[PDB]
Amino acid sequence: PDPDELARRAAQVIADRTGIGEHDVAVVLGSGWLPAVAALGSPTTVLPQAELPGFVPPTAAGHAGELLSVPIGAHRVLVLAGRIHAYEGHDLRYVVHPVRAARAAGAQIMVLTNAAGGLRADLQVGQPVLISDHLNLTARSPLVGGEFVDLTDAYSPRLRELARQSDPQLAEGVYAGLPGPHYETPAEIRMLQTLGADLVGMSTVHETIAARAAGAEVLGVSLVTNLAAGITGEPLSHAEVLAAGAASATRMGALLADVIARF
Amino acid sequence: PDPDELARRAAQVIADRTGIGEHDVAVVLGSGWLPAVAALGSPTTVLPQAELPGFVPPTAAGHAGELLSVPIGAHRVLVLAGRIHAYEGHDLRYVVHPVRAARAAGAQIMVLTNAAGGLRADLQVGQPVLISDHLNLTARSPLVGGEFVDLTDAYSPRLRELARQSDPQLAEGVYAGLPGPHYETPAEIRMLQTLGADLVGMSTVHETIAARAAGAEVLGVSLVTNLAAGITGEPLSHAEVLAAGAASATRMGALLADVIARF
Amino acid sequence: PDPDELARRAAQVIADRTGIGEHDVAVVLGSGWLPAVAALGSPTTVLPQAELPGFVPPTAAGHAGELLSVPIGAHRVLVLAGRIHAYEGHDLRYVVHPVRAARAAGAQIMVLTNAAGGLRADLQVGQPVLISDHLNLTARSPLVGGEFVDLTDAYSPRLRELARQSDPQLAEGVYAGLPGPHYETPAEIRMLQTLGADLVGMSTVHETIAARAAGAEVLGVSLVTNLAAGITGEPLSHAEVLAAGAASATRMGALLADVIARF
């Protein structure tokens, strides 16, 4: 039950079931990014997350997602379809366990994807934005002892350059992670603008900190699924977030495959 | 024990005990606002909150307040005398249950009142200020699943206009909700000024988010009970907060009755 | 088990074991400040914190620190060697219990020391900085009822003047307390700069609020152990923090002894 022990055990199961000793990249799919899977490549192995140690919070029954093993270029990639966010009420160890288990299975790069509100003038709905840095505004950490991790270049600049070779149209921005699940007030958005954020969302920051803690590099990719509250007046809804996710799914899947191949 | 089930059950008790099928407005009284009750109108039914499902946190014995049924104009109003704030240590479901139960009893408008420190130059002690928007600075939410609520116009502009017809002297401002129960340092107040806040307090933000989630409109009213730490130098105390509440009680009760009548 | 009852009981043990009815000053040593003890003075009594009521969180076995009784000038000083921070996962009552117990043993002044990242241009590694005020950015409080404490001059200006008589080179600054244990991103540091912070760390804010709540004056002293993330590019590590602590230990111990003597 130490998160690191269940991570090791998950990796044993992954290697055993896939035949693959080392998956060197992993992908965590954001809200609304699920339809991008087909466009990533064809999975050779599909593992229910429930059949893997440490993925499911002990209580609250509910059909977790899948973990896919997908060849992308010269990489074997672990793709996380379905995830748990802090707003679900479970210990952060479940929010970040996929990262830790992927790391234990050999992932040296974590591609952490999300749905985000755009805060910056230039941003359009459907636009992918690389994460240059983050503001963790949750007052929490997935780390528990005296485990001090340096977050300078938490979002690898070189993976960034790598990504922009694949799509020179890729802007980058600072992502603010909030608890959710309520969206923000217009006043809260003006505040985030003041604090230096370009993107806003309810995930990612803990996955990033756990990745860094475990020694992996991180590429962060936001899909702008809406403009942030108050910027245009358009109402925010999860259905609208899923809808933007699904409209951009072939683009996102294709982008991720090209970038990952380039690693 | 689902908060929505205890809300429904509370509403059954309310309708049964008051004879009133639908209370279409509710009022949550702020710290120090208790003496305003007399001035709201005469209650036809008084219900100990302890006799209502879901109001009292299982543990920590202590004499909760009352829920009053009060005719105000063409409305039957549920008035909450006594409440629980997050600084008490209980699950947020108890902080917001009065809102949810009022909603289940038919309230389509929640008048959420509070005591606040004034951050903006123009503000005087004893002055009521409408809440135009809020900064939730608690890192928490009363919502728990994937329950995504849009907080654009969380504080109904039209209820605002409505209120100002009753008292054209009503300024409005952005309210920052903090955890408490310690008051703020002068440095924290300068920070809140930078973040765009006009008012500061230890309640309200969760009641507002739960209201919106449940489909009610919100009118937020702050009594400025003191200037925020560092602005004038005057020391902050709860006795001083209660004292300002009590000095302004007839004014506040009268204001609320007039505004509510106008709904 | 009320924190105040275990505080009283700890003070009974302290007075019994030291022979000293009243220790009028206490010192809480920061990360990396442990080697400063020798330079404070020679302890007359050394008490394992485990032998004192309320210091150790019920679970998670681990060798706590010591509480030392040290004559410094005309004062008997309680010196805390080893402490618990919020990032350890324990209830805040354990983070602040040393303050409360010291107060119950007669401490009217708490010298709260820490390791901090420097955010302001002028700051050098190894430099002690007095805390003029704080930003509590944890979304938490060590206070639990309706216990409202005014934090105006939480860091006694007069103790400040007192300290600067001992070392006229002492700059002062606003300290931001964050949860940790991950260090900050460069974007988070630019945000803290915007919010008015000069120093950043993972302790102190709760000890200060508990001190004030209990009626003690506070002197806050940060050792700048590194420049904050992104300011110079230098990587942050706990080993580097301990190393700066140890290099500055004789200076810090000597400074504290001189200042405390002057009280």
Ligand code: HPA
């Ligand atoms: O605007 C947003 N805010 C918070 N989370 C989100 N997830 C998608 N869009 C948003």
Ligand code: HPA
């Ligand atoms: O100044 C304040 N700060 C926080 N809460 C308050 N409640 C009344 N006044 C205040």
Ligand code: HPA
């Ligand atoms: O830079 C810092 N940030 C947070 N905590 C710290 N403790 C020492 N230095 C630091």
